[PDB]
Amino acid sequence: PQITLWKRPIVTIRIGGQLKEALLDTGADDTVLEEMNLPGKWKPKMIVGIGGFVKVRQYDQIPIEICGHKAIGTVLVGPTPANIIGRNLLTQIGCTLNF
Amino acid sequence: PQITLWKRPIVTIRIGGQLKEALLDTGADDTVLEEMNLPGKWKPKMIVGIGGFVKVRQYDQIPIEICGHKAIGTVLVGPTPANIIGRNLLTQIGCTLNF
Numbered sequence A, B: 001p002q003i004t005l006w007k008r009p010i011v012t013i014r015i016g017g018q019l020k021e022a023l024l025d026t027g028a029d030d031t032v033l034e035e036m037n038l039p040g041k042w043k044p045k046m047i048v049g050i051g052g053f054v055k056v057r058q059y060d061q062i063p064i065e066i067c068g069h070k071a072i073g074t075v076l077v078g079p080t081p082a083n084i085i086g087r088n089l090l091t092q093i094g095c096t097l098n099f
């Protein structure tokens, strides 16, 4: 698709058989989803947030479908105010910025 | 231009004789710049990021040149981790996400 920016670029994603809404986010390096359980081993991780670091859980090699495009990559889980899809997965689905 | 997302989408911006670098950020509603004195009336504002709120000054009708494109609109000024071009100006320059 082509997604304009008059409104927040939010799309439906599918992960672990669950459907969620997530923000296509070119200013984030990583993909961060709200608190949830995923299958497998995870590592503790700190990401740079407002007023300090935010603690998240890192899951690697997770299949995730983004607006019907398949990715397999790293998903961070934690207390984000919004589900965000970052560059690690935007590149996998062939997403560019254009003007 | 097409901008890929293998690295941070950073571009040169000009505002009023200042020449800075900033992220083209589809995840940001509004444009947020690091320390600079802009002319005109300001209004205090609190804006959400991961891990907390940043207190900013909101200025209206600020010209920024972005990759040779002329934008004019709201600019927020505060302790932001990075200079950010948000949707309010990204739309003005005709920026879309494509995949």
Ligand SMILES: Cc1c(O)cccc1C(=O)N[C@@H](CSc1ccccc1)[C@H](O)CN1C[C@H]2CCCC[C@H]2C[C@H]1C(=O)NC(C)(C)C
Pocket (backbone or CB within 6 Å): A025, A026, A027, A028, A029, A030, A031, A032, A047, A048, A080, A081, A082, A084, A086, B025, B027, B028, B032, B047, B048, B049, B050, B054, B080, B081, B082, B084
């Ligand atoms: C999540 C993430 C990573 O995993 C790695 C690197 C950066 C980020 C990251 O937080 N990126 C942000 C840019 S602000 C920024 C922060 C740190 C470094 C560079 C830029 C997002 O693109 C924007 N981010 C998207 C989104 C995040 C969840 C809360 C709602 C918005 C808030 C918005 C935001 O933070 N707003 C500002 C006021 C700071 C502009």
